[PDB]
Structure 1
């Protein structure tokens, strides 16, 4: 009751064990260094930034380059205890990343900016 139907010999499947290391190769996990305080460096305070603050309900920040929109949004929410509608990002020709964080309609970007220190 064992007949080869096909004329091709394939390599039979064999057991593949999961690793059970006798020691971790690293004593401790590497600490995350792109935390919320490292994500937002400082708010941009320029005439265009002030226009965005007072007209678009948008805060302008300079952020880390490796940060993405999800990380920037979460970091802003945690640092300033606020809600974010959306985040647009660009990388400036000097290499810094600039983020326009549009806040929720129920939040006044002017009051929040005053709390932060700008305007």
Structure 2
């Protein structure tokens, strides 16, 4: 029992885990940025349809809170598709627009018809 330093450091006391008697909130918050909530509607513009037929990419207006990862999961789940990459820009309207390019197994123009944009 030898003090080799002229300093007194606070002894490392134990700190227990929480085992709470009741949960603060009754139910977990059901998620509101789901697949349908995240993809609002496709753009049907001159540009968008020109992008569809020339670059093999869809143009959606996307919920402003959403990541590229959440978009890429959503379109895959909502259209039975595969995505090369997603590129997002926030417009001067205060709404996101997500260019979802498809992997070459799927044609944008084949998918545009069945979702109902032409």
TM-score when scaled to structure 2?
A: 0.99
**1:106 Cα offset (Å):** 1.3
Whole-Å Cα distance in 2 between the matches of residues 70 and 64 of structure 1?
A: 13
Q: Where do 5+ consecutive residues of structure 2 fail to align?
A: none
**1:110 Cα offset (Å):** 0.2
After the TM superposition, which parts of structure 1 deviate over 4 Å for at least 4 consecutive aligned residues? none
Q: Where do 5+ consecutive residues of structure 1 fail to align?
A: none
The aligned length equals: 118
Residue 77 of structure 2: aligned partner? 78
In the alignment, structure 1 residue 69 sits paired with structure 2 residue 68: yes
Whole-Å Cα distance in 1 between the matches of residues 48 and 65 of structure 2?
A: 22
Q: What secondary structure is seen at the aligned counterpart in 2 of 1:99? A: strand
In the alignment, structure 1 residue 40 sits paired with structure 2 residue 39: yes
CA offsets, 1:57-107, max 9 Å, x none?
000000100001000000000000110110000000001100000001111
RMSD: 0.5
TM-score when scaled to structure 1?
A: 0.98
